[PDB]
Amino acid sequence: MDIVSVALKRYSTKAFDATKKLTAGEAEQLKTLLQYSPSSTNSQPWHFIVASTDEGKARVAKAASGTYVFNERKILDASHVVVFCAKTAMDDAWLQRVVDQEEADGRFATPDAKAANHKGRTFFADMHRKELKDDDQWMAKQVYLNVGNFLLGVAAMGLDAVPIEGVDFAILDEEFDLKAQGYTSLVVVPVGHHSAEDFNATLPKSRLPQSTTITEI
């Protein structure tokens, strides 16, 4: 697969064609990509809101009013809009949920194997939630890893997307009652097909030279 060509062709969509929708199969693949991203210890400390109705997208778009109005149209016009959310705390129940799911999927040959996995994950989680008091940051980082996986994955599907931090995430959290549910919103990714007006699709891609960013040893 020519993934480098995918990486060089994908770009941050500036306008979506509001008439072009994902197929049913594409929508399923989108959710599979969200689900199957890796994460530290397979902790999966995340929730996703996938908005595909006009009202659902309008609820997300409420967070882009005023200061962030330049991002509001992207949210309204795309086919499917993903709100990436992190857990606000790594609680005991979630750690148990993850390891129980690994058992349900047949990853452990014995109780001892499950216990070793649980102990190892709990060690890392405790380092963050007890020692460093940064489990919120640790989990948010895993969500961003998922975003990076997602942007390349949808590009490889032939879909356009744009990662969006330019919204009011406090408004978004309130609109979707996220804090009470144990989550906080971090990134919005509209997905679809760019419009004929979006000339960012052809503008040269710009990055700092490797002589600046890469040291080879």
Ligand X SMILES: Cc1cc2nc3c(=O)[nH]c(=O)nc-3n(C[C@H](O)[C@H](O)[C@H](O)COP(=O)(O)O)c2cc1C
> Helix or strand or coil: residue 50?
strand
Q: Which stretch binds a second copy (CB under 8 A): 16-24, 51-59, 71-79, 190-198?
A: 51-59
Q: Among residues 119, 165, 179, 197, which one is catalytic?
A: 165
Mark whether 74 is an active-site residue: yes
- Choice from 64, 163, 188, 190 touching a second copy (CB under 8 A): 163
Mark whether 14 is an active-site residue: yes
Task: Specify whether the CB–CB gap between 138 and 128 falls below 8 A.
Answer: yes
For residue 129, give every residue at least 6 positions away whose Cβ sits within 8 Å of its Cβ, in sequence order, or none. 89, 90, 135
- Choice from 20, 21, 29, 126 touching a second copy (CB under 8 A): 29
- Choice from 61, 147, 167, 188 touching a second copy (CB under 8 A): 147
Q: How far is the CB of 89 from ligand X (least distance, A)?
A: 18
5 is in an annotated binding site: no
CA distances in angstroms from 93 to 43, 57, 82, 123, 128, listed in the order given:
12, 31, 25, 15, 16
Contact flag: residue 195 with ligand X (CB under 6 A): no
Task: Specify whether the CB–CB gap between 211 and 104 falls below 8 A.
Answer: no
Task: Specify whether the CB–CB gap between 173 and 179 falls below 8 A.
Answer: yes
- Choice from 96, 116, 132, 148 touching a second copy (CB under 8 A): 148
Partner whose footprint covers residue 71, from ligand X, a second copy, none (CB < 5 to 8 Å by kind): ligand X
17 or 143: whose CB is closer to a second copy? 143
CA distances in angstroms from 180 to 88, 89, 144, listed in the order given:
10, 12, 22
Catalytic residues: 14, 74, 165
